[PDB]
Each structure stands twice: as C-alpha cells, then as structure tokens.
Design a protein around this motif. Sequence first.
Motif, PDB file in Angstrom:
ATOM      1  N   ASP A 109     -58.241 -28.076 -21.249  1.00  0.00           N
ATOM      2  CA  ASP A 109     -59.077 -27.654 -20.120  1.00  0.00           C
ATOM      3  C   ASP A 109     -58.404 -26.599 -19.244  1.00  0.00           C
ATOM      4  O   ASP A 109     -59.062 -25.673 -18.751  1.00  0.00           O
ATOM      5  CB  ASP A 109     -59.479 -28.862 -19.266  1.00  0.00           C
ATOM      6  CG  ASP A 109     -60.330 -29.866 -20.031  1.00  0.00           C
ATOM      7  OD1 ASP A 109     -59.864 -30.382 -21.073  1.00  0.00           O
ATOM      8  OD2 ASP A 109     -61.464 -30.144 -19.579  1.00  0.00           O
ATOM      9  N   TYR A 110     -57.092 -26.751 -19.059  1.00  0.00           N
ATOM     10  CA  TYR A 110     -56.293 -25.849 -18.228  1.00  0.00           C
ATOM     11  C   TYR A 110     -56.253 -24.419 -18.785  1.00  0.00           C
ATOM     12  O   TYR A 110     -56.419 -23.449 -18.035  1.00  0.00           O
ATOM     13  CB  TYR A 110     -54.877 -26.420 -18.053  1.00  0.00           C
ATOM     14  CG  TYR A 110     -53.941 -25.614 -17.172  1.00  0.00           C
ATOM     15  CD1 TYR A 110     -54.243 -25.358 -15.830  1.00  0.00           C
ATOM     16  CD2 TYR A 110     -52.733 -25.134 -17.676  1.00  0.00           C
ATOM     17  CE1 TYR A 110     -53.369 -24.623 -15.023  1.00  0.00           C
ATOM     18  CE2 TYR A 110     -51.854 -24.404 -16.879  1.00  0.00           C
ATOM     19  CZ  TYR A 110     -52.175 -24.152 -15.559  1.00  0.00           C
ATOM     20  OH  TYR A 110     -51.296 -23.432 -14.784  1.00  0.00           O
ATOM     21  N   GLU A 111     -56.059 -24.301 -20.100  1.00  0.00           N
ATOM     22  CA  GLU A 111     -55.949 -22.996 -20.762  1.00  0.00           C
ATOM     23  C   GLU A 111     -57.297 -22.271 -20.903  1.00  0.00           C
ATOM     24  O   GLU A 111     -57.329 -21.066 -21.171  1.00  0.00           O
ATOM     25  CB  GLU A 111     -55.246 -23.115 -22.126  1.00  0.00           C
ATOM     26  CG  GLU A 111     -53.848 -23.767 -22.107  1.00  0.00           C
ATOM     27  CD  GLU A 111     -52.847 -23.103 -21.158  1.00  0.00           C
ATOM     28  OE1 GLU A 111     -52.794 -21.857 -21.090  1.00  0.00           O
ATOM     29  OE2 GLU A 111     -52.092 -23.840 -20.491  1.00  0.00           O
ATOM     30  N   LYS A 112     -58.397 -23.000 -20.719  1.00  0.00           N
ATOM     31  CA  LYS A 112     -59.741 -22.416 -20.794  1.00  0.00           C
ATOM     32  C   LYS A 112     -60.252 -21.942 -19.434  1.00  0.00           C
ATOM     33  O   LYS A 112     -60.782 -20.833 -19.320  1.00  0.00           O
ATOM     34  CB  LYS A 112     -60.738 -23.400 -21.421  1.00  0.00           C
ATOM     35  CG  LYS A 112     -60.647 -23.511 -22.936  1.00  0.00           C
ATOM     36  CD  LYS A 112     -61.330 -24.773 -23.441  1.00  0.00           C
ATOM     37  CE  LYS A 112     -60.774 -25.187 -24.796  1.00  0.00           C
ATOM     38  NZ  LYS A 112     -60.977 -26.639 -25.068  1.00  0.00           N
ATOM     39  N   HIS A 113     -60.088 -22.779 -18.409  1.00  0.00           N
ATOM     40  CA  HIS A 113     -60.612 -22.482 -17.072  1.00  0.00           C
ATOM     41  C   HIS A 113     -59.585 -21.786 -16.185  1.00  0.00           C
ATOM     42  O   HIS A 113     -58.377 -21.871 -16.431  1.00  0.00           O
ATOM     43  CB  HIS A 113     -61.131 -23.754 -16.396  1.00  0.00           C
ATOM     44  CG  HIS A 113     -62.254 -24.414 -17.135  1.00  0.00           C
ATOM     45  ND1 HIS A 113     -63.476 -23.806 -17.332  1.00  0.00           N
ATOM     46  CD2 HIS A 113     -62.341 -25.630 -17.724  1.00  0.00           C
ATOM     47  CE1 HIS A 113     -64.265 -24.617 -18.013  1.00  0.00           C
ATOM     48  NE2 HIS A 113     -63.601 -25.731 -18.263  1.00  0.00           N
ATOM     49  N   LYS A 114     -60.079 -21.105 -15.151  1.00  0.00           N
ATOM     50  CA  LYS A 114     -59.222 -20.305 -14.272  1.00  0.00           C
ATOM     51  C   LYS A 114     -59.299 -20.676 -12.783  1.00  0.00           C
ATOM     52  O   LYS A 114     -58.283 -20.619 -12.085  1.00  0.00           O
ATOM     53  CB  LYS A 114     -59.490 -18.806 -14.477  1.00  0.00           C
ATOM     54  CG  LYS A 114     -58.385 -17.870 -13.981  1.00  0.00           C
ATOM     55  CD  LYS A 114     -57.266 -17.675 -14.999  1.00  0.00           C
ATOM     56  CE  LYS A 114     -56.118 -18.656 -14.807  1.00  0.00           C
ATOM     57  NZ  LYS A 114     -56.263 -19.905 -15.599  1.00  0.00           N
ATOM     58  N   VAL A 115     -60.487 -21.050 -12.306  1.00  0.00           N
ATOM     59  CA  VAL A 115     -60.677 -21.422 -10.893  1.00  0.00           C
ATOM     60  C   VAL A 115     -60.386 -22.912 -10.655  1.00  0.00           C
ATOM     61  O   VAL A 115     -60.906 -23.780 -11.356  1.00  0.00           O
ATOM     62  CB  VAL A 115     -62.094 -21.032 -10.365  1.00  0.00           C
ATOM     63  CG1 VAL A 115     -62.269 -21.443  -8.891  1.00  0.00           C
ATOM     64  CG2 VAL A 115     -62.346 -19.525 -10.533  1.00  0.00           C
ATOM     65  N   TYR A 116     -59.532 -23.178  -9.667  1.00  0.00           N
ATOM     66  CA  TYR A 116     -59.142 -24.526  -9.250  1.00  0.00           C
ATOM     67  C   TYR A 116     -58.824 -24.480  -7.757  1.00  0.00           C
ATOM     68  O   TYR A 116     -57.938 -23.729  -7.338  1.00  0.00           O
ATOM     69  CB  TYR A 116     -57.887 -24.993  -9.998  1.00  0.00           C
ATOM     70  CG  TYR A 116     -58.088 -25.405 -11.440  1.00  0.00           C
ATOM     71  CD1 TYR A 116     -57.758 -24.538 -12.485  1.00  0.00           C
ATOM     72  CD2 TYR A 116     -58.576 -26.672 -11.761  1.00  0.00           C
ATOM     73  CE1 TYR A 116     -57.928 -24.913 -13.812  1.00  0.00           C
ATOM     74  CE2 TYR A 116     -58.748 -27.059 -13.086  1.00  0.00           C
ATOM     75  CZ  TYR A 116     -58.425 -26.174 -14.105  1.00  0.00           C
ATOM     76  OH  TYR A 116     -58.596 -26.555 -15.418  1.00  0.00           O
ATOM     77  N   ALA A 117     -59.524 -25.281  -6.955  1.00  0.00           N
ATOM     78  CA  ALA A 117     -59.361 -25.230  -5.494  1.00  0.00           C
ATOM     79  C   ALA A 117     -59.550 -26.581  -4.794  1.00  0.00           C
ATOM     80  O   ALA A 117     -60.445 -27.348  -5.156  1.00  0.00           O
ATOM     81  CB  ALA A 117     -60.321 -24.194  -4.902  1.00  0.00           C
ATOM     82  N   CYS A 118     -58.715 -26.869  -3.792  1.00  0.00           N
ATOM     83  CA  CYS A 118     -58.975 -28.009  -2.900  1.00  0.00           C
ATOM     84  C   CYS A 118     -59.710 -27.584  -1.619  1.00  0.00           C
ATOM     85  O   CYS A 118     -59.317 -26.622  -0.946  1.00  0.00           O
ATOM     86  CB  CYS A 118     -57.720 -28.871  -2.614  1.00  0.00           C
ATOM     87  SG  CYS A 118     -56.086 -28.054  -2.492  1.00  0.00           S
ATOM     88  N   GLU A 119     -60.790 -28.308  -1.318  1.00  0.00           N
ATOM     89  CA  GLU A 119     -61.653 -28.031  -0.169  1.00  0.00           C
ATOM     90  C   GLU A 119     -61.346 -28.923   1.037  1.00  0.00           C
ATOM     91  O   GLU A 119     -62.086 -29.866   1.338  1.00  0.00           O
ATOM     92  CB  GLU A 119     -63.125 -28.157  -0.567  1.00  0.00           C
ATOM     93  CG  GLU A 119     -63.670 -26.944  -1.304  1.00  0.00           C
ATOM     94  CD  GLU A 119     -64.071 -25.806  -0.371  1.00  0.00           C
ATOM     95  OE1 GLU A 119     -65.125 -25.180  -0.633  1.00  0.00           O
ATOM     96  OE2 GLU A 119     -63.349 -25.534   0.619  1.00  0.00           O
ATOM     97  N   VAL A 120     -60.250 -28.600   1.721  1.00  0.00           N
ATOM     98  CA  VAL A 120     -59.803 -29.326   2.911  1.00  0.00           C
ATOM     99  C   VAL A 120     -60.819 -29.174   4.051  1.00  0.00           C
ATOM    100  O   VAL A 120     -60.922 -28.110   4.672  1.00  0.00           O
ATOM    101  CB  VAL A 120     -58.392 -28.850   3.376  1.00  0.00           C
ATOM    102  CG1 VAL A 120     -57.940 -29.626   4.600  1.00  0.00           C
ATOM    103  CG2 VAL A 120     -57.368 -28.983   2.256  1.00  0.00           C
ATOM    104  N   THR A 121     -61.574 -30.240   4.307  1.00  0.00           N
ATOM    105  CA  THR A 121     -62.553 -30.256   5.403  1.00  0.00           C
ATOM    106  C   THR A 121     -62.058 -31.091   6.602  1.00  0.00           C
ATOM    107  O   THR A 121     -62.836 -31.786   7.271  1.00  0.00           O
ATOM    108  CB  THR A 121     -63.960 -30.717   4.924  1.00  0.00           C
ATOM    109  OG1 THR A 121     -63.863 -31.996   4.285  1.00  0.00           O
ATOM    110  CG2 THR A 121     -64.565 -29.698   3.949  1.00  0.00           C
TER     111      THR A 121
END
Lengths: 216, 214, 214
Positions: free
Chosen positions: C185-197
């Motif tokens: 999954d890591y080598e396929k996808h590029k966007v990864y984000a934490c949404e600190v609210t």
Amino acid sequence: QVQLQESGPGLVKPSETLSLTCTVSGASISSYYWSWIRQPPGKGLEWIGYIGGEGSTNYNPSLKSRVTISVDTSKNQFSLKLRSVTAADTAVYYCARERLGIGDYWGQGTLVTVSSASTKGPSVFPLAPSSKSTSGGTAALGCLVKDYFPEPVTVSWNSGALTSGVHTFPAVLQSSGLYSLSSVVTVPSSSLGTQTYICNVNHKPSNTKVDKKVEP
Amino acid sequence: KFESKAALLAARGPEELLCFTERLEDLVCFWEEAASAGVGPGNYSFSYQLEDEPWKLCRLHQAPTARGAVRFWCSLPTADTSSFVPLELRVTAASGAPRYHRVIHINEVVLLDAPVGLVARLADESGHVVLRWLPPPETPMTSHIRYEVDVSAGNGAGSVQRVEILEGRTECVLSNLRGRTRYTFAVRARMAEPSFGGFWSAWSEPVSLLTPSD
Amino acid sequence: DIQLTQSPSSLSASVGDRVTITCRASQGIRNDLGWYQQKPGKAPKRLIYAASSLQSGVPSRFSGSGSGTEFTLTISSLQPEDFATYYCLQHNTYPPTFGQGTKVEIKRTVAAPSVFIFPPSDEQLKSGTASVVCLLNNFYPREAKVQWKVDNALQSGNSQESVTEQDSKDSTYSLSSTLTLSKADYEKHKVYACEVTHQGLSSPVTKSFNRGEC
C-alpha cells in the motif's frame, strides 16, 4: 539512607513461581518490618504480607494459600516466593519498609506479565526531521520501540545526559499480541548541527541492547 | 489506681487497644474481652519500637476485670519514654495473627489521678460553700493542672452546677446555692498546657454539705 | 478485609487553589490511616502517616485529618508537580487495604499542539509495513481528534493511538498516532496526512511527507 531494588524481572507462564528479591541498603534489616505490594495496571493496589528481622510473617488471606516471604540477614535482602501463577497475577510489584502501614519508602517497581506468549525482541529506527529548505524554528527527532513482549522498555538518551524534552509514550496493544512504543525529543535546529541524537534502549526480558542515532 | 484508670477509659471503644500515661514516666497499654478456658498472657505477644530501635515488649499481664472480663496490659521505662516522638506497637496473637498495629503519641494520652483531700465549708461570709482540694499526688509540675468542680444536688433531687477552675488553682467559692438543700462536691483533673493533651481524671472522692436555712 | 471508598473518583484543579480528598471506611479505624502519592513513572511515596502526622520530607502543603470513619487529605496549594494519584490505606484491621484511588489533574491555560510527521526511515520498509509517526508536542486540553487519511479520504479504525501522562513541569499532554498499512500500500499511494482538529488553533492544521521527496 533508605534504598531498595528488586531482582530478576520478566515473564511467567501459568501455575509457575516468582523469584523476586529486594536489595536493602542503608539501615540494618535487623530492626524493621518489610512488605511487598501488588497492583493490576489501572485497578488498585493490594498489600500482600510482612516480615521482619523477627522471622515472623503475615500474608493476605487472598494469597496466603500461596504466598511465602523469606529473609536473609547477611545477604541483607528479602525474597518473595509466589507459586500457582495465573492471569490474576498480571501486576506491578513493590517492596517497602513497614515503619507503620507502608514503609516511608517503596522499591523502584517491577513489572511481571503472565501469558503463553514468550520473550519478543523490540526493533529500533531513527526519525529524521521531514524538512525541505523552507521554514524551521525548533525540531523533533526520535528512535522507536516496535513489536515486543513483555515489558518493561526503558529508553534514555546518550548515557542519560539529555533530559528536558523527552516524551516516552505509553505502550499500546496492537493485534499481533505485541506492545509498541515511540520515544521523541525536542530541540531547536540551532543544535541539530553541533551534536547527534543517540538513545540507548534496554528491554531485559529479551535482553535487547540497541544504539540507533538520528541525524538530520 | 490501675483498675480505676483502666475503667475510666474502657468507657468507649469495643476491642480497642488503649495505651495511656500517668505521671508521665511510663506509658501503659491495655485491651479487653473475656472468652473461655483456652487463653492466657503467653497467648498474645506485644511488640514495640521507640521509633527506630530494636523491637521489645509492652510486656504482657492478664487480670480479671471486676465486670467479669479479662484485661491484658503492660508498661514501658521512663528515660526511654521521651515525649512528642511517636511510638509504634505491634500486637499479635497465638501464631502472629496481628490484632493491633498502632502508632501512639506518648505526650497525648496523659491521664491523671483524681485530686484528693477535698474540703467543703460554709462561708462565714454569706450563702456560699468554699471548696479547697489538693492536686493528684506524685504528679509532676502541678502548676499546669486545670480542674473542674462538679456540684450535685443528689439522686433524689437529681441536679447539677459545673465550674472550670483556672489552671493551677485549688480553691473556689460556690455561690447561688439554694438554702436547706444537700450539696455533693467532687473535683477532677487534666494537664492544662502546653502540647500534651489527655483525659479527665476520675472525680475526687466527694464531700457533702447540708446548707442552712435561707 | 476493610473497604476504603474514596471520592471524588478523580479531580481537576488549577495551580494555587485548595484540593480536598475524602476516604470512607466500612468500619471506623480511627487514627490508623496513611495517605499516599503515586507519580506516573515512580514508586509511591507516603505523605501522611497515623491519619494526620506529616512524613519527613513531604511538603507542608499536604496535610490530613479525620478519625474513625471518614478521612480527609487536603493539598493546601496545588503545584504542577502535584500531579499524581493519591491513595488512603488502613492498617487497623488486617489485612492493610487501600482506596479506589483519586487521580488529580492540573487545570492549565489552553495551549496549541506543535505538530510533526516523521519519515519511516529506510530499514522499517524491510519489515514490510507502513507506519507514520504523527506527534503533537505539548498541548492542552487532552481532547484530541487525530484523523489519518490516505489520498484525501477519512478512514475506519486505521490509526494506532497513544497519549502521554501530564507533564510535571508545565502540565501539557503529548500524543502519538501511527498508521497501519502493508508494504504494498505504501509503495502505491503518495498522500498521507493527520487532521489535527485540536482546540489549540481556531482552525485545523496538517503536515505530510512524500517518498519521492528525499
């Protein structure tokens, strides 16, 4: 001086025994009375029993069926012996000096877990700052402690020199039946240049001794 | 002396251990409960520690209480007894099943003997009684003992008046007493100050006067 | 065994003000109690002994009173280091027994969570698993909502949660969240984000990293 330390921590498999002993140094064990204490993590403390230079003992009716407390004068220490271990023994264990109902002073504290699962070694990885060349200020870094059994995992920083900034996180049960950690640290990038970040982990159950630095 | 000052305290708390101290030289520990044929002093064990020494014996003695019960008790030396400093004692049964493990502050259980030499007389000066007494014998620096006088008007009459005697005083005039009645005066005692708290002594043995006509 | 039921269960006080804790016993023990303090990483320490006598070494801002059946420990002025869980113990009637255990927390002016997101350094990729270390250095209050998202889409039970014990010095929590995904999954996808609210800012804040951005 009043000091106490518990020997040989680790793991135990059901209906087996425990060999916790307590190194006493300062005043002579000839005098006072000594106790052990138990605590299931986030549940409550239970007193187990006492013992003096008297030889005499007493054990909680909740463990008297099992419990034995020992006393060696020349050794200047006292041993807990506990048999028929189970999943109601998954707890923190302290030694103390009963001057009254506690003992002014408790022993550091020892963890001992109980299951079928055996010793498991933790892994260590650096975490460099994810900077470009855009905007800075401070900076965070860190090693890591991943997939291990049981506990405890103490993590310092370069022979315990660095301090103000450390935030070792609580272990959490994953799914692989193994805890995991996370050990960060905060300092400006003003000193990310004149020194490197080297932590010295220890996990005595599976004797893991790592040394992973964290560069820019 | 003993039986009495034991009695005074047994007046509250069931199976409790009550150490107290008299002339402030030796503390004395005790507790109660008759049961059956299989007991004795050698049945229990009394361990103390003048904070931080090798443990010893608030060392046992059995006795039967007039009430038909049993009392276990014991004392401790004077020079060793240096007040204000705590003391913890551990009291175990046949086998070292523990029945007391208490901390007690010697200085705060001072129990006095009753005053004595009580003397009431009419007042060659009006309708008052004049009361004189003497401090509990053998009590160190009397000058800080406060007393309280009681005035009964008697079982048949069943009445009262109470008075707080200034610390170190042994006299007091009793005014406002009805004519032709029979008054019974008794005095008790406690350490005034400072620090060392405690309990009222027994009432001194009383003395009655019959008051003249109005 | 005797039951010591403390209250309130936990607490939340500012620096300065006067915290008070009670402790009720299933049977009056009178004098025979100790209060205790348990710091997070530390073996527990004994504030009060014999119900009201302060231990040597402990601050005088700690005191205890009460007798028989109810007991009070009272911290006269709260400190940030006064964070900890307090327990009452009883040794009147063996066995000694503790209380449930009032945990107390330090109310402290609202603070903003200084955020970081670090690279799974190359050596963790031979394990065969993705894990992004999203940290929130020094914040307040605890109320945290960190939502991870792969290529702008909110996920279900994907993250891995941890949270530190309140700071002894400036009283601030710090969080640790990690993402779970396979090396595939890591080598396929590029966007990864934490949404600190978090409440710290008046708008969400988000940091990320790409693998092709070394």
